[PDB]
Amino acid sequence: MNLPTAQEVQGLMARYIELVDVGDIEAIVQMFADDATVENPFGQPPIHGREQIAAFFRQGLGGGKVRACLTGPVRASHNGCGAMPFRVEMVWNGQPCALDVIDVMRFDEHGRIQTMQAYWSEVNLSV
Amino acid sequence: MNLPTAQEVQGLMARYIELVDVGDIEAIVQMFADDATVENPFGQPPIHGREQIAAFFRQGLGGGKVRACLTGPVRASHNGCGAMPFRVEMVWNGQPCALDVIDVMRFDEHGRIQTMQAYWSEVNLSV
Ligand SMILES: O=[N+]([O-])c1ccc(O)cc1[N+](=O)[O-]
Ligand SMILES: O=[N+]([O-])c1ccc(O)cc1[N+](=O)[O-]
Ligand SMILES: [Cl-]
Ligand SMILES: [Cl-]
Ligand SMILES: [Mg+2]
Ligand SMILES: [Mg+2]
Ligand SMILES: [Mg+2]
Numbered sequence: 028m029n030l031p032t033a034q035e036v037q038g039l040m041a042r043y044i045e046l047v048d049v050g051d052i053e054a055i056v057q058m059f060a061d062d063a064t065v066e067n068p069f070g071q072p073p074i075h076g077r078e079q080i081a082a083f084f085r086q087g088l089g090g091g092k093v094r095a096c097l098t099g100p101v102r103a104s105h106n107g108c109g110a111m112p113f114r115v116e117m118v119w120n121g122q123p124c125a126l127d128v129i130d131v132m133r134f135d136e137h138g139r140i141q142t143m144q145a146y147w148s149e150v151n152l153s154v
Numbered sequence: 155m156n157l158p159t160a161q162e163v164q165g166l167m168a169r170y171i172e173l174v175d176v177g178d179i180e181a182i183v184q185m186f187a188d189d190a191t192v193e194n195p196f197g198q199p200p201i202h203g204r205e206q207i208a209a210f211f212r213q214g215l216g217g218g219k220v221r222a223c224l225t226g227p228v229r230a231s232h233n234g235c236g237a238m239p240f241r242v243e244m245v246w247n248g249q250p251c252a253l254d255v256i257d258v259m260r261f262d263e264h265g266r267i268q269t270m271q272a273y274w275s276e277v278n279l280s281v
């Protein structure tokens with residue numbers, strides 16, 4: 028595809044959350060441009076490239092059980108970008124905890140994620 | 155104040171929504187740096203400076219009745235930034251309509267909004 032339209036951004040960003048929710052690390056990584064960046068949380072230096080991004084998703088999703096779900100609609104733009112609110116549910120030392128996040132993404136002219144910025148801080152974690 | 159901490163960002167961004175919700179145009183504008191930018195929606199060129207920003211809030215809030223409320227928590231950073239999901243309720247040609255938005259803000263070293271980016275597109279409007 029080309030630079031995604033607003034509708035296409037909403038579909039891609041929702042599909043990303045679906046893939047996170049099931050934990051399909053390889054399918055998630057494919058959604059990113061080969062040279063994409065991730066800033067997690069926003070405020071920390073970016074990681075770069077699909078192998079580092081794969082390592083990030085292996086670290087986050089390969090361990091205990093993880094779920095993720097949109098908590099409201101994707102807000103998209105007409106320049107290939109969007110923002111979405113979601114909650115991640117996981118386990119910490121065996122006890123159920125959640126993290127509220129907003130991801131901001133920019134897509135490239137092939138429909139792949141060029142940049143991802145995950146807004147959250149420690150108070151967004153609840154046990 | 156200085157560059158707001160994560161907790162301070164959550165308070166400032168919630169206070170912004172409170173001021174939008176009541177429609178206190180002058181108090182809203184005071185929250186911005188004198189030379190701040192606003193991108194509404196994200197994808198459009200920025201407006202610049204408190205007078206243009208005041209004109210933007212007069213245009214959006216001075217007419218029919220407008221409400222705004224967070225639809226989930228503020229996600230803050232440790233570098234003076236944050237993102238929040240909210241809904242704006244207004245009237246269009248007399249009929250109740252809503253707009254789902256995510257604002258991303260960066261604050262300056264005085265606790266004022268330096269940049270605001272409002273993510274939304276037309277499908278986020280509902281009648
Ligand atoms: O904090 N995280 O790990 C995180 C942040 C943003 C995301 O889109 C996904 C994850 N995750 O896979 O868990
Ligand atoms: O779309 N808008 O007008 C808008 C966008 C973001 C905001 O933080 C506030 C408004 N408003 O005052 O209505
Ligand atoms: Cl929402
Ligand atoms: Cl939320
Ligand atoms: Mg699922
Ligand atoms: Mg490329
Ligand atoms: Mg109120």
Ligand SMILES: [Mg+2]
Nearest residue numbers: 187188189262
């Ligand atoms: Mg200044």
